[PDB]
Design a protein around this ligand. Structure first.
Ligand code: HEM
Ligand code: HEM
Lengths: 146, 146
């Protein structure tokens, strides 16, 4: 769970990230497929627009973060994505890889505007968001096997 | 995390529980020490007022639940309690025992006013609250050993 100070940092910086949003998500997607090529097969690798799915991944993290004090209002969105995640075989162990690369992309694009304090706050926000997905997906996986 | 429907149930029933608050917490305390006598030594078993600590335990759960959509505002209270929990040697495995007995006490006192749907919602709220304590305490324990 986030403390108020961390929430305030997210609130203050979400608009900076969104101003650079296409560049962050595009950098994330490129870095993810270049540094972790093992995740490529899980996505649709159509020749031209092969970055659109991982760009939307990163963009949705940013959108969930801007909504971090009302995650219950977006739980129905989280559940729809979870079904797709479970059908693609996304595992809890994938989530730290994605978080690492997203934080890396934010620093790569924002430069000195992404301080250690700001990156730490985004890291904590990502963890809270990921934990919701992991739990929903764990339950869905358990329903399908029992 | 709670969904909105569950949050609404907690919001609607917290005042019913508080109207019976002394009776719920007293019943919880008696049942806890009678059905799980192994937890007795962790508390202060002074002759007369030996129920005041576990009554305050239950009352604070109810207070956290009424604040379940702003847990960040009570995190400083959670941290102070966590230090006491860690000094008493409270373990993650204690939390389902306490939740079981608190839900049992709520049903015992409220009777037919505590429906299955209401009890299920209080069970989910307890889990979210306990998870915050467990995480804070896990970190504190790790600081003291490393
Ligand atoms: C951390 C929070 C995450 C969020 C908010 C999120 C969000 C999304 C969204 C919105 C989509 C739909 C994309 C679209 O159809 O346009 C998606 C799809 C997908 N994501 Fe996630 N994701 C997260 C984590 C992950 C992780 C850790 C992986 C692991 C590789 C992952 C892999 C996938 C895959 C394989 C798809 C399938 C594409 C599709 O069917 O649309 N996602 N994710
Ligand atoms: C589930 C959420 C819980 C909450 C909100 C909570 C709350 C509290 C509070 C407010 C106190 C201080 C009591 C006072 O001094 O008046 C306390 C103390 C204590 N609680 Fe917890 N508690 C929880 C879980 C537990 C659990 C699972 C145990 C396991 C047995 C536990 C055992 C203790 C003990 C041994 C004390 C020491 C009494 C003291 O130093 O005051 N608590 N708890």
């Amino acid at each position: 769970m986030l403390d108020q100070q961390t929430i305030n940092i997210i609130k203050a910086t979400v608009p900076v990230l969104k101003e650079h949003g296409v560049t962050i998500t595009t950098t994330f997607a490129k870095n993810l497929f270049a540094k972790h090529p093992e995740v490529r097969p899980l996505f649709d690798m159509g020749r031209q627009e092969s970055l659109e799915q991982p760009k939307a991944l990163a963009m949705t993290v940013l959108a969930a973060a801007q909504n971090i004090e009302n995650l219950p209002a977006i739980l129905p969105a989280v559940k729809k994505i979870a079904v797709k995640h479970c059908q693609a075989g996304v595992a809890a162990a994938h989530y730290p890889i994605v978080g690492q690369e997203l934080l890396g992309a934010i620093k790569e694009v924002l430069g000195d505007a992404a301080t250690d304090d700001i990156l730490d706050a985004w890291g904590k926000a990502y963890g809270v968001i990921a934990d919701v997905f992991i739990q929903v997906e764990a339950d869905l996986y358990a329903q399908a096997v029992e």
